[PDB]
Amino acid sequence: NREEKILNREIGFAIGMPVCEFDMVKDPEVQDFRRNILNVCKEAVDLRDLNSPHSRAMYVYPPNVESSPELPKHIYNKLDKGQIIVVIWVIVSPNNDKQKYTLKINHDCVPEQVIAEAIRKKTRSYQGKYILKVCGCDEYFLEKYPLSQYKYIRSCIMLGRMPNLMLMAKESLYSQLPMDCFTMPSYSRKSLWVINSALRIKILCATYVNIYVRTGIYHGGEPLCDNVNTQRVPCSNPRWNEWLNYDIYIPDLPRAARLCLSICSVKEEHCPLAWGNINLFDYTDTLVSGKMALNLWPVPHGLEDLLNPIGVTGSNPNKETPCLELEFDWFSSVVKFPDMSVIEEHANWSLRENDKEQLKAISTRDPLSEITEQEKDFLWSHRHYCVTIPEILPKLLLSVKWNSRDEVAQMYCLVKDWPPIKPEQAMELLDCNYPDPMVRGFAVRCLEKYLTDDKLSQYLIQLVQVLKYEQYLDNLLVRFLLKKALTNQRIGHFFFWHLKSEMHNKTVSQRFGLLLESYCRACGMYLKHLNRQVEAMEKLINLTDILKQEKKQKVQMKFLVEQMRRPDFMDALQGFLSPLNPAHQLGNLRLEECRIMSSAKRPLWLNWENPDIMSELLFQNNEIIFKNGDDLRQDMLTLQIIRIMENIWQNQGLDLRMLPYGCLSIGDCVGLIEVVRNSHTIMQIQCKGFNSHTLHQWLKDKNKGEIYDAAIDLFTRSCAGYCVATFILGIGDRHNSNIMVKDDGQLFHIDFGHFLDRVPFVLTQDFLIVISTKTREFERFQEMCYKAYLAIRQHANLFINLFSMMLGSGMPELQSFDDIAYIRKTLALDKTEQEALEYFMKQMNDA
Numbered sequence: 001n002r003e004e005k006i007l008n009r010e011i012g013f014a015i016g017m018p019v020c021e022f023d024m025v026k027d028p029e030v031q032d033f034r035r036n037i038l039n040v041c042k043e044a045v046d047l048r049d050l051n052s053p054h055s056r057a058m059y060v061y062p063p064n065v066e067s068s069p070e071l072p073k074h075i076y077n078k079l080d081k082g083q084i085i086v087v088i089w090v091i092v093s094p095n096n097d098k099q100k101y102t103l104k105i106n107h108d109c110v111p112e113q114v115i116a117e118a119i120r121k122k123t124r125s126y127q128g129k130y131i132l133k134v135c136g137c138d139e140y141f142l143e144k145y146p147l148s149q150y151k152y153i154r155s156c157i158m159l160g161r162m163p164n165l166m167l168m169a170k171e172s173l174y175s176q177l178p179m180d181c182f183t184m185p186s187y188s189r190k191s192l193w194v195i196n197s198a199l200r201i202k203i204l205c206a207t208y209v210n211i212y213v214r215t216g217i218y219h220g221g222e223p224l225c226d227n228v229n230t231q232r233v234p235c236s237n238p239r240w241n242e243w244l245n246y247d248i249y250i251p252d253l254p255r256a257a258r259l260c261l262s263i264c265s266v267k268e269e270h271c272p273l274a275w276g277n278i279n280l281f282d283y284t285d286t287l288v289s290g291k292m293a294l295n296l297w298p299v300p301h302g303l304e305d306l307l308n309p310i311g312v313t314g315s316n317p318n319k320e321t322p323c324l325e326l327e328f329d330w331f332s333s334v335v336k337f338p339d340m341s342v343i344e345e346h347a348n349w350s351l352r353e354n355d356k357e358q359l360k361a362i363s364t365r366d367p368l369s370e371i372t373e374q375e376k377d378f379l380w381s382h383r384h385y386c387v388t389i390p391e392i393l394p395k396l397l398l399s400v401k402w403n404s405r406d407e408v409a410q411m412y413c414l415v416k417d418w419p420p421i422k423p424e425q426a427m428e429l430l431d432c433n434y435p436d437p438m439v440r441g442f443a444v445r446c447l448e449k450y451l452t453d454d455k456l457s458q459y460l461i462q463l464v465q466v467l468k469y470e471q472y473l474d475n476l477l478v479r480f481l482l483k484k485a486l487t488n489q490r491i492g493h494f495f496f497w498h499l500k501s502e503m504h505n506k507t508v509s510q511r512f513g514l515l516l517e518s519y520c521r522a523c524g525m526y527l528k529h530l531n532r533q534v535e536a537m538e539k540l541i542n543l544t545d546i547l548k549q550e551k552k553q554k555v556q557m558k559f560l561v562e563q564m565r566r567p568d569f570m571d572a573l574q575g576f577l578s579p580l581n582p583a584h585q586l587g588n589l590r591l592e593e594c595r596i597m598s599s600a601k602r603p604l605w606l607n608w609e610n611p612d613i614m615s616e617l618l619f620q621n622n623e624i625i626f627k628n629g630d631d632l633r634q635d636m637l638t639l640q641i642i643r644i645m646e647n648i649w650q651n652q653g654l655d656l657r658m659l660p661y662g663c664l665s666i667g668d669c670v671g672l673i674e675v676v677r678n679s680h681t682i683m684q685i686q687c688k689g690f691n692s693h694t695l696h697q698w699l700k701d702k703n704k705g706e707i708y709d710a711a712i713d714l715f716t717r718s719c720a721g722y723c724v725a726t727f728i729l730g731i732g733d734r735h736n737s738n739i740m741v742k743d744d745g746q747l748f749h750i751d752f753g754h755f756l757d758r759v760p761f762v763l764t765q766d767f768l769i770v771i772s773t774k775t776r777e778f779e780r781f782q783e784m785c786y787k788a789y790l791a792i793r794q795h796a797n798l799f800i801n802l803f804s805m806m807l808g809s810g811m812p813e814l815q816s817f818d819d820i821a822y823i824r825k826t827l828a829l830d831k832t833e834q835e836a837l838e839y840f841m842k843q844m845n846d847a
């Protein structure tokens with residue numbers, strides 16, 4: 001049909017590749033994913049039309065609210081008698097005159113009540129037919145949340161800024177919601193446990209090799225047996241035809257058992273050449289058998305062993321690569337993995353205060369710590385009691401002998417009834433260590449029960465990353481994330497961008513491609529907007545490309561203006577939403593304000609006019625830095641962890657104002673960076689006005705009177721935070737231009753080159769002089785840094801988990817758990833609270 005064709009062209013433009021290539025993929029699991037994945041879209045759409053227009057508006061404009069409505073102590077103290085002042089605006093008449101009505105109401109009031117008292121104040125000079133909007137952006141207070149719980153409101157309370165809201169008619173916004181229609185695509189309409197034996201695979205011959213074959217059977221990151229090398233053979237004729245046998249009985253193969261193979265070379269000095277992984281069981285629970293042609297992959301940078309089991313699974317798309325032919329045993333009938341029922345029949349067929357405390361002490365340990373064999377057998381012999389302390393489940397999982405059908409089954413049964421655990425702990429079971437399907441299933445259930453959309457968005461990038469660790473295209477995690485993204489555009493955005501940014505990586509081109517297809521096919525009119533965005537970025541990447549090649553600094557600016565002035569460019573880079581925050585409208589380019597940043601890598605400084613009716617109450621211009629050339633993933637993770645830390649200190653009662661500015665990777669070493677209005681570098685303050693005593697003076701001039709004190713406070717608190725943080729994360733070398741301060745005293749860092757590889761933030765005499773060595777102010781400062789350090793050491797588990805999940809991404813500074821152990825060093829996990837305290841005190845003495 002017509003709608004089908006158009007939708008296909010647009011989806012092709014958004015994903016980057018045309019849909020018609022997915023069709024030509026003669027692969028059962030691919031087609032069955034593209035089809036079977038559709039009832040998730042159905043569920044989401046049904047949820048969208050369930051309450052009709054209100055449900056739609058909620059789908060497009062979800063409430064940006066904190067996780068818990070409760071407010072910390074100091075935050076509540078910011079309120080005058082537990083109340084808040086709020087300015088509600090109204091546009092009226094043909095001239096759209098703006099009239100303001102100020103109010104003082106309880107911070108726990110519902111937006112409906114705010115509208116009530118607002119109309120009351122408007123008449124003293126009509127029921128709930130109105131909704132509240134944020135003056136200057138596209139945020140709406142559509143749900144009956146307490147106003148203070150909205151991120152915008154709580155922020156306004158902490159910063160001391162007064163909220164400016166706009167009263168809008170419900171029908172004026174509903175009239176803006178398009179009538180979407182999800183059209184179904186045109187592409188929608190045995191022995192088991194008996195096999196007794198040992199695993200043996202035959203390698204036949206290799207092609208495209210102009211050395212031996214090392215192989216192994218692994219369960220995630222652990223080999224279910226010993227690796228076996230095939231007979232060394234001359235490189236000219238790649239013909240082994242050999243039969244390798246493994247010390248693993250066929251029934252004893254876990255559900256997620258994988259074959260990991262590679263081709264090593266011989267000078268003595270061994271070096272891999274091409275790697276590949278195969279699922280012993282397919283997506284229909286069948287067991288591999290017969291011949292199979294597997295196209296291998298080149299080796300990633302920084303490889304330790306002659307095997308890459310953590311690498312993606314499947315046959316290389318580029319068939320013009322080393323292709324290995326394998327031969328699996330074929331038995332009487334098509335063998336399947338037993339049903340959970342038979343697992344229960346074989347499962348059923350197959351204690352002192354001292355150790356009662358020992359188990360607790362074990363569960364208290366962090367994930368990085370290793371578990372000894374005696375401790376593994378210990379936890380296993382105590383597998384039933386470990387159910388009362390559910391947070392020990394990960395370590396318990398690590399104690400199972402996954403090469404024994406018995407233990408595997410009994411563990412399955414222990415999972416079918418295991419108590420749910422908190423999300424932060426549930427994600428721990430979603431990294432590469434836990435590849436089992438029922439384990440990841442349990443974790444996904446936990447996330448479905450206790451994960452707030454706030455926390456989901458906060459932990460989105462990691463989840464999208466652990467997608468790569470899934471054994472099959474169609475799984476529970478992908479369906480959960482996809483439904484959440486098809487019911488919450490605030491999540492669907494960074495879902496689509498986290499996915500698209502890696503469409504250049506052929507390791508996951510297929511997966512993320514199909515997923516992105518199913519998403520774009522059911523996301524609604526927003527697809528259009530995304531396309532516009534994808535075009536804008538497109539154009540940008542072109543220009544920067546021509547800037548870093550043909551005209552690779554004043555001439556660069558001239559050329560840039562001329563290319564930018566072309567109408568194609570003007571249209572394609574005007575009137576679209578900010579990929580950093582889709583609530584931000586970006587209208588006409590203010591070219592007179594755009595420029596090349598003249599620092600390194602030719603950063604592009606872009607300035608747009610804010611088209612919002614009330615753009616003046618937020619910012620009349622939105623400035624962003626398009627950078628093409630520098631990998632932004634590391635910066636994304638760093639800023640994320642900074643926001644999380646800030647939320648921890650706030651939820652703990654110490655106001656250390658951090659600044660986790662935006663930062664979104666949208667492709668291969670391309671991305672956007674949020675501009676912090678009114679900020680300058682240390683070196684810039686030192687310049688205007690070798691010298692190290694004019695920072696305090698500059699701040700004093702920029703903050704005269706009763707403001708002075710306030711300013712100081714900020715610069716202190718923030719500073720302390722950015723100190724502690726930078727010490728724990730081991731951020732790269734800081735200097736006078738890596739650091740920045742705002743005209744109000746806010747201090748924050750930028751450009752986190754490399755982390756986890758030592759006191760980087762050696763507070764210079766500037767900062768110290770700004771805080772007051774022997775002064776009560778410095779004492780309060782030290783107390784702050786100590787408190788913060790403790791607060792973070794109390795979530796070392798969370799952070800370590802986050803990194804362990806981010807391993808899947810090919811970031812250089814994060815290639816193995818060895819890189820993560822650094823945090824285990826700086827946090828003093830193996831020591832006690834006091835021991836770690838002395839550790840941080842002494843570490844901070846080393847000026």
Ligand SMILES: C[C@H]1COCCN1c1nc(-c2cnc(N)cc2C(F)F)nc(N2CCOCC2)n1
Pocket residue numbers: 597599600603625627630631632635661673674675676677679737750751752
């Ligand atoms: C715009 C400001 C204020 O808002 C916060 C962001 N800021 C900022 N970020 C960066 C940056 C950080 N991280 C990266 N991975 C890459 C970059 C890239 F832009 F180079 N660089 C700069 N430079 C501009 C002034 O001259 C020298 C420094 N400024």
